[PDB]
Design a protein around this ligand. Structure first.
Ligand code: FAD
Ligand code: ZN
Ligand code: ZN
Length: 815
């Protein structure tokens, strides 16, 4: 039959134009018009007797037979417009089609020309399989494979949407909305170029934007989360499908957190300075990596060091040949050269498929839904995909969170069609959206086979009232004195101590007894007799600083000499504000004491000469540096307690790494998922650290500007000075909170580092211990002697860390 051949060509097509032509021919052979909705899907299923393409109809009917859809009657009177035909746009189009609505989709492009590989969560894999992914794609997730190229996913979803009866227009670009000018008329979309009269005269009730990237409809507010400057590089190599390429195992690594030996070896051998790397064995060998500006400049990948990052990575600034050599070297070192000769795949323009991207900042919208009313007509606008939350590619959360957003948007549309008020709909949507940025395979229902539109099948302990309708009224359209409390708290804490009085916040501390009194009051029964009978001339202040640093976990901001001299009042104010914020109602102290023990176990900035300010100060060994000046001399990496050392010979700091049946299937799948979980944890830690560093830089710059303005203009009114000091104290509080969070992160980083080092050391020990009595020499004995003490030290540190964690958990469960 002609219909059978047409259906086979439709299933096996590999190009968008081929899919469209095959579907047009198939609909012509059946006397049908594409875009007829659910009725034409029923007609195709009934009138196509294939006897081998029957499991597909079973899967589609099982999916469409859920009670939530009400047999395509939940949204039978609503009209929708989807902008963009990416994976998320096609997914939401399919979801809206199943509910029984009329879906019109518009795509700017006319081809699917993206070969990059996306990672898939288990529920995403099950969801795609339930739609008949194996029929449309033979190699879909066979074995432990959990990824798919962008164009293959797009083709699969396009075939499903075409079968379900969705009208799709290609080459049309959405630009804006046409408001109704008269009563009784709906909304229309501005499209470029001039569209067919049927499309241009189409009035819709729902607008779902899935344009991804940075596109956003007017009326939506988007804010970007920034980070340290990172340069991403993606590359695709042709996969020969030979056996030798199949035994090559996939690898992944993150800087100094996960799989560090790879990065150290790669830097030592080739000179490639990377931050993270991920490799995928999909239809093409896919490599994604992160690199820094210095290495790219050194190797000639970039021409000039332009401060503007937009011009830094422009087409006129990158050298394609240098980039190709860079990527080839990184890839062939990553896979031990087992892949043989690597030959780049070709993109749409015939160039090699290697590219560079900006990985610094990610956009995200403040709200995921809006309502606009004019002449009594109401329009609901929703965001799905990258246009809602921009993903970090190495983390592999794009498809999963896009699908979750699509499900939530379809649920919102179904609630909207029921006649519920706009405010409650928006409140529920925002309540659901509040959880999107923290979604993970671990904190959702483990029964992924029961997922659906209803949020209760996906989000545990769901609260649909987490946002009240009064907080979303702006999304509906119709057409200070911290100083006084600080002084009062100091006065009330100093009270009861004999021989002291606090009348101000600047000169009362010159005596030096007040600091000791405060430290004694915070923790009772520490000391007293030594200072009373002792001289205590400028030594009381230093002792108070030392005991506060070593016991109360508060780093000093102002030197004791400046305290007694009174030449640094703002530093004293910042110190007292840290005291006030700490006990207004730890990890830093633990890290400091660990660094002190490591240092003992061996038994005006002073580096750059520019003036230090109150916020940029960082005190160590009794000396103050810029927070940004504390880096290793060789790798120029940020130093943290417990992993740095100082050489008195040169007076420099160096890091420790620079200091001179199906049972087998299920088992393998669980092992791969655990490895992916570890990598994701490390990558999330690294990303959060970069964000914290960027925020600290921004707040330090702002505080320096404020403090310089306060100092230079000494004729300002007193109230403005009070306001400036209040803002400075708020900045100090924010900086302290960020530092505490960073210390919390470094605790886990240290745990991971010691675990990895212990594993490597035991592997080395078991390698040494394989030699028998016949193979014995002084070298083996020395190796055993040198490794045993290392194992002793690491296990001692492991007991120290588990003791700290046990104490923390006991304190948490105390209350
Ligand atoms: C070049 C590129 C490379 C990527 N590489 C990776 C990678 O290696 N790993 C990874 O995890 N993620 C990667 N992504 C992101 C990945 O595509 C998304 O995570 C995921 O595909 C979600 O797609 P989306 O529909 O939200 O956005 P997209 O698929 O990017 O956008 C949807 C579509 O909307 C269309 N469109 C745009 N503007 C308009 C308009 N005005 N009118 C009509 N249609 C419009 C575009 O043609 C686009 O194809 C990449 C994205 C791009 C653009
Ligand atoms: Zn400095
Ligand atoms: Zn170093």
């Amino acid at each position: 039959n002609p219909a059978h051949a047409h259906f086979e060509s439709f299933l096996q097509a590999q190009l968008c134009q081929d899919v469209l032509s095959s579907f047009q021919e198939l609909c012509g052979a059946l006397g049908l018009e594409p875009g007829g909705g659910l009725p034409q899907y029923h007609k195709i299923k009934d009138q196509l007797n294939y006897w081998s393409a029957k499991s597909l109809w079973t899967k589609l009917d099982k999916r469409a037979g859920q009670p939530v859809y009400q047999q395509g009657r939940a949204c039978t009177s609503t009209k929708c417009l989807v902008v963009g035909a990416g994976p998320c746009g096609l997914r939401v189009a399919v979801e809206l089609a199943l509910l029984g609505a009329r879906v019109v989709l518009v795509e700017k492009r006319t081809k699917f020309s993206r070969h990059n590989v996306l990672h898939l969560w288990p529920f995403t894999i099950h969801d795609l399989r339930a739609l008949g992914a194996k029929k449309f794609y033979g190699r879909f997730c066979t074995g432990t494979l959990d990824h798919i190229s962008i164009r293959q996913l797009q083709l699969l979803l396009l075939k499903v949407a075409l079968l379900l009866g969705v009208e799709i227009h290609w080459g049309v670009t959405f630009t804006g909305l046409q408001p109704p000018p008269r009563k009784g008329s709906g909304w229309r979309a501005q499209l470029q170029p001039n569209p067919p009269a049927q499309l241009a005269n189409y009035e819709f009730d729902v607008l779902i934007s899935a344009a991804g990237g940075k596109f956003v409809p007017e009326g939506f507010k988007v804010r970007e989360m920034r980070g340290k400057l990172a340069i991403g590089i993606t590359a695709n190599f042709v996969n020969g499908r030979t056996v030798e390429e199949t035994q090559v195992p996939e690898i992944s690594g993150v800087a100094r957190i996960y799989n560090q030996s790879f990065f150290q070896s790669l830097l030592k051998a080739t000179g490639i300075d990377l931050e993270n790397i991920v490799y995928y064995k999909d239809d093409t060998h896919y490599f994604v990596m992160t690199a820094k500006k210095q290495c790219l400049l050194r190797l000639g990948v970039l021409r000039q060091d332009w401060p503007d990052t937009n011009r830094l990575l422009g087409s006129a600034n990158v050298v394609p040949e240098a980039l190709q050599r860079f990527t080839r070297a990184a890839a062939d070192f990553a896979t031990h050269g087992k892949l043989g000769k690597l030959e780049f795949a070709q993109d749409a323009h015939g160039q090699p498929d290697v590219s560079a991207f900006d990985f610094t900042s990610m956009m995200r919208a403040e709200s995921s839904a809006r309502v606009q009313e004019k002449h009594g007509a109401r329009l609901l606008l929703g965001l799905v995909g990258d246009c809602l939350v921009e993903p970090f590619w190495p983390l592999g959360t794009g498809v999963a969170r896009g699908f979750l957003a699509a499900f939530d948007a379809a649920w919102m549309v179904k609630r909207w069609a029921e006649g519920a008020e706009s405010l409650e709909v928006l409140a529920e949507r925002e309540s659901l959206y509040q959880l999107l940025s923290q979604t993970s395979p671990e904190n959702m229902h483990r029964n992924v086979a029961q997922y659906g539109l209803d949020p209760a099948t996906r989000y545990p302990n769901l609260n649909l009232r987490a946002v009240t309708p009064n907080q979303v009224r702006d999304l509906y359209d119709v057409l200070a004195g911290t100083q006084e409390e600080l002084l009062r708290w100091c006065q009330e804490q100093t009270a009861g101590y004999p021989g002291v009085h606090v009348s101000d916040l600047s000169s009362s501390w010159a005596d030096g007894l007040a600091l000791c009194a405060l430290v004694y009051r915070l923790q009772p029964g520490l000391l007293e007799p030594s200072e009373l009978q002792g001289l205590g001339a400028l030594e009381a202040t230093a002792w108070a600083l030392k005991v506060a640093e070593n016991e109360l976990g508060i780093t000093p901001v102002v030197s004791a000499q400046a305290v007694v001299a009174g030449s640094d009042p703002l530093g004293l104010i910042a110190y007292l504000s840290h005291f006030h914020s700490a006990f207004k109602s730890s990890a830093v102290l633990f890290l400091s004491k660990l660094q002190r023990t490591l240092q003992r176990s061996r038994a005006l900035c002073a580096l750059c000469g520019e003036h230090l300010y109150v916020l940029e100060r960082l005190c160590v060994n009794g000396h103050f540096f810029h927070r940004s000046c504390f880096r290793c001399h060789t790798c120029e990496a940020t130093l943290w307690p417990g992993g740095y050392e100082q050489h008195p010979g040169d007076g420099h700091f160096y890091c420790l790494q620079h200091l001179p049946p199906t049972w087998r299937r299920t088992l393998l799948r669980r092992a791969k998922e655990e490895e992916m979980k570890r990598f994701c944890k490390a990558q999330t830690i690294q990303r959060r650290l970069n964000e914290i560093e960027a925020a600290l830089r921004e707040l330090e710059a702002e505080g320096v500007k404020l403090e310089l303005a306060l100092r230079r203009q000494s004729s300002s009114p007193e109230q403005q000075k009070k306001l400036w000091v209040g803002q400075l104290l708020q900045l100090v509080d924010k900086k302290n909170s960020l530092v505490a969070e960073e210390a919390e992160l470094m605790i886990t980083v240290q745990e991971l580092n010691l675990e990895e080092k212990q594993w490597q050391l035991d592997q080395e020990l078991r390698g040494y211990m394989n030699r028998e009595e016949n193979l014995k020499t002084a070298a083996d004995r020395q190796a055993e002697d040198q490794v045993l003490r290392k194992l002793v030290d690491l296990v001692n540190q492991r007991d120290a860390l588990i003791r700290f964690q046990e104490e923390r958990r006991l304190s948490e469960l105390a209350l």
